[PDB]
């Protein structure tokens, strides 16, 4: 219980516990111009 009773962490820097901000990464070169074809990740992912 002591090992699992971590103190409550503070939320994101801007204030809040709800959700990250997301960000886009990657591209497929081309005919098509795959510029919006990419990966999406939560931006902080650990902001607490």
Partner 1 sequence: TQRVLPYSNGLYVINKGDGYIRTNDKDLIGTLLIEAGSSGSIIQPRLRNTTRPLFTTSNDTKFSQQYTEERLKDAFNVQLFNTSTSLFKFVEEAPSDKNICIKAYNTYEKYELIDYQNGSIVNKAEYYLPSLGYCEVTNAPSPESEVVKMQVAEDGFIQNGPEEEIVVGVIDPSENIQEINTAISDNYTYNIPGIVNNNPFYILFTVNTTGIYKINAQNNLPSLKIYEAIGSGNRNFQSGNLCDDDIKAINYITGFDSPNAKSYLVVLLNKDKNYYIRVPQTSSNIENQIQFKREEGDLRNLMNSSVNIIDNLNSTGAHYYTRQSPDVHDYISYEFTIPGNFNNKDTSNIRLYTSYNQGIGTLFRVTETIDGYNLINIQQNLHLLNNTNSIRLLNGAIYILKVEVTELNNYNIRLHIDITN
Partner 2 sequence: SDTIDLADGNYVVRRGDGWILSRQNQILGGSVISNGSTGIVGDLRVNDNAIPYYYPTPSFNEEYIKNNIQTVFTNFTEANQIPIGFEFSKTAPSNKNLYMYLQYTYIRYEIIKVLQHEIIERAVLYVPSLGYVKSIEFNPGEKINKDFYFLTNDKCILNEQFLYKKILE
Partner 3 sequence: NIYETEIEGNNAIGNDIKLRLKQKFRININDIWELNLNYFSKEFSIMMPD
DSSP string, 12-32: -TTS-SS----EEE--B----
Q: Report angle CA 36, 12, 44 to the nearest 5 degrees.
A: 35
Which of 33, 48 has the CB closer to partner 1? 33
In the complex, least distance from residue 36 CB atom to partner 3, rounded to whole angstroms = 22
Per-residue binding letters, 7-46, with partner 3 (x by CB under 8 A)? -xx-------xxxx---------------------x-xxx
- The single residue among 22, 26, 27, 48 that binds partner 1, judged by CB under 8 A, is 22
């Amino acid at each position: 219980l002591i090992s699992t009773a971590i103190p409550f962490p503070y939320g994101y820097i801007g204030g809040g516990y709800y959700a990250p901000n997301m960000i886009t990464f990657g591209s497929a070169p081309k005919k098509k111009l795959n510029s919006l074809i990419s990966s999406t990740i939560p931006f902080p992912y650990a902001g607490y």
